[PDB]
Ligand binder design. Sequence first.
Ligand SMILES: *[C@@H]1O[C@H](CO)[C@@H](O[C@@H]2O[C@H](CO)[C@@H](O)[C@H](O)[C@H]2NC(C)=O)[C@H](O)[C@H]1NC(C)=O
Ligand SMILES: *[C@@H]1O[C@H](CO)[C@@H](O)[C@H](O)[C@H]1NC(C)=O
Lengths: 596, 193
Amino acid sequence: LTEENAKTFLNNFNQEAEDLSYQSSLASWNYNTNITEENAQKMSEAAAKWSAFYEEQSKTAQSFSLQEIQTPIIKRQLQALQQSGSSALSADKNKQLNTILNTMSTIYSTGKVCNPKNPQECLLLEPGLDEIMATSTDYNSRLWAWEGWRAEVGKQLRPLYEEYVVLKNEMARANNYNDYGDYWRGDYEAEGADGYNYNRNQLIEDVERTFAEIKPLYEHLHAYVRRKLMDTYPSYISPTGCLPAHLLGDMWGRFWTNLYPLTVPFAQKPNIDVTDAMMNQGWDAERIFQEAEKFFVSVGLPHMTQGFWANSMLTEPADGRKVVCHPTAWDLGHGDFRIKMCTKVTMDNFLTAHHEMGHIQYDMAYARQPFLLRNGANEGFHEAVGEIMSLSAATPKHLKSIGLLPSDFQEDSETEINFLLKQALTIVGTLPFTYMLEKWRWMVFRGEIPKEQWMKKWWEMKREIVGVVEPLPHDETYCDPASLFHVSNDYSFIRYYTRTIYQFQFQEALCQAAKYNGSLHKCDISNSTEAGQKLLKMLSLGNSEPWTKALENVVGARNMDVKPLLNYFQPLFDWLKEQNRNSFVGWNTEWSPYAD
Amino acid sequence: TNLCPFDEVFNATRFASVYAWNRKRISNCVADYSVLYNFAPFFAFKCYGVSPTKLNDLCFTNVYADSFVIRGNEVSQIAPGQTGNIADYNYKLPDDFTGCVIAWNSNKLDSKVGGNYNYQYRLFRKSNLKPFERDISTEIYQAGNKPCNGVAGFNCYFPLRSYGFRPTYGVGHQPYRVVVLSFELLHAPATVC
Ligand SMILES: *[C@@H]1O[C@H](CO)[C@@H](O[C@@H]2O[C@H](CO)[C@@H](O)[C@H](O)[C@H]2NC(C)=O)[C@H](O)[C@H]1NC(C)=O
Ligand SMILES: *[C@@H]1O[C@H](CO)[C@@H](O)[C@H](O)[C@H]1NC(C)=O
């Protein structure tokens, strides 16, 4: 039997799971958009019910042999319900983990820093320090906010992270895994055929091979940026040194997109940042989401449902209730799709409308698969779909069709350099940070670093991999990595690394499918219905096939390939080479702000 | 003036369940099908065996109206020669069907905040139905060879499951009221039109 009893067992699991997992998402949505003391309780109760159901159904399914007597898709569904998730922890350990996670989330969300002159004037992270670190140019103003943020919440987050790591390492040990890092790296395992195979330990050697051909390109960008910043700050800059942490454009340094005004190549030519045109022409938050839907329809993808325009937030509700402004795309189930985002009229919030709507199109595509197979083919596939759309939406000629640039705008070499430098400030500038942070977390989880040497190894890897110096030294009490939202909310961060390679592979494949002749950084797949079915055939698969086969279906490869990325930045590599003819490429780790 | 009861099967306050559908036998009346277009928007009106034009020179001995409530993804299953959960365990149509179906969206009446659990369907029957058979029995379904005695677990399942309709689902998972008309020409001489 077995194979005939498995179909009836899954047909009973599915309709219970789809109903008991919908009212746990409708409670989280009602909490994230309202925030009170009742919605939190309802969310906790619904999550507890959904966890109890899953832990009951996962031990029952661990009695179905699976030697080799089944069909492929049933085997894939059964090999995904036999994981037990985090239910291996006992009641006490699970309660401790939930309490620690909730405390860290509340501390991070409610963290605030008060002005020294007026103790009654305090600013939060979102409408406060973010604007200072994104738009200010004063050394003292930028240093103060950074120091205050790293000294108020980061120092408080230290004690909880120890028990967090201990418990999540124990639960990974219980689940036949060496550590929790290997648990996070287990998303890259494929078993569907011969040749279409991969192992969760191969990830570290590939993620290192790929970060060898890229650093030569990043070094020239670092040299140019520091050359500009030296003119910006003659005093607190050393040419043979590393960049200060607070002078990076953000609170951490994730994206250097805010350094474009300081390091713009040619000021005379029209700007690529069309924020002012959007403000003047009279664009509201609804038009931003309507011009980002006409792009998906032209390429040949479905319209947004009618329950997306009436249920989504799309703008801060004002009124009196508190909301979380972190952009998110929600797939509540039973055909309910939503997007939560506090949209503003800026170019940065414009491209972001294409990233998050690219999650809804991907969710809308594999909604025909069984319940257990409704996920991205890989944790890095899901974030690489919005980015290829944002790449095409940002080209200097796509902004002329929608009217954001003058009809007599002239495109030439200067415009190409402007566009490429702006694009590289966001894409190249985030790769070393992502790789280093994930490497540090992987090394901590694997217990290769003592508890008394965390920050010293952190700020030592920064100035050998990334190249960012610290303004003031930190003791062992300081907890700097806990500042990031992803670190303190238990999220993987390696998705943003393989995302940046899958991005360019998919972009080149789609450009070739659209029959485009020319450079890669001017693709504009818009108005091409033959490059919207090549992607959709891949999006509508889910977990039903190995990620290697899904990648081969589109790009004709079975692994990461970094050659497509290098063609994108080819015109920028040369100009940076000649512009750095008489500059010392590289940074000095031995240098320090203090003597000796 | 003798009108025919087409508002007691089209304008009811609550319909039946899929597994316990209502059959009403219309006879001795003057059939005015034009009033069927009173709703106007119809999700489906495909008609089998006859023409939608309703040639006036058509007289039938009896009419049967079968009414129930399904999802929007299951309307295509109400047709001759289909398969699924509704056309195998709930409602089966013969391959020589004469008559046709009418479905329309009913989200403003059958959807409630918190869920509407008054509508049920059958799963796990162990055998396909025969045309126009109801089967409202409720007994524990066993899938293996271990006896089940009043206990629902592991390989023993309850055959009836609820829809739990809520607003804000989407066209696919949203309520749809379906009424199917079948026309019969019995061997007795026709006097009813
Ligand atoms: C946001 O949440 C608050 C608190 O839950 C809601 O205010 C109360 O909502 C309950 C039902 O959810 C009502 O019974 C009370 O009468 C409400 N109180 C007041 C003073 O109105 C509020 O409605 C929620 N906002 C929404 C749903 O938009
Ligand atoms: C159903 O009954 C209501 C109540 O009077 C009426 O307004 C509507 O026209 C009726 N619809 C029909 C008969 O199709």
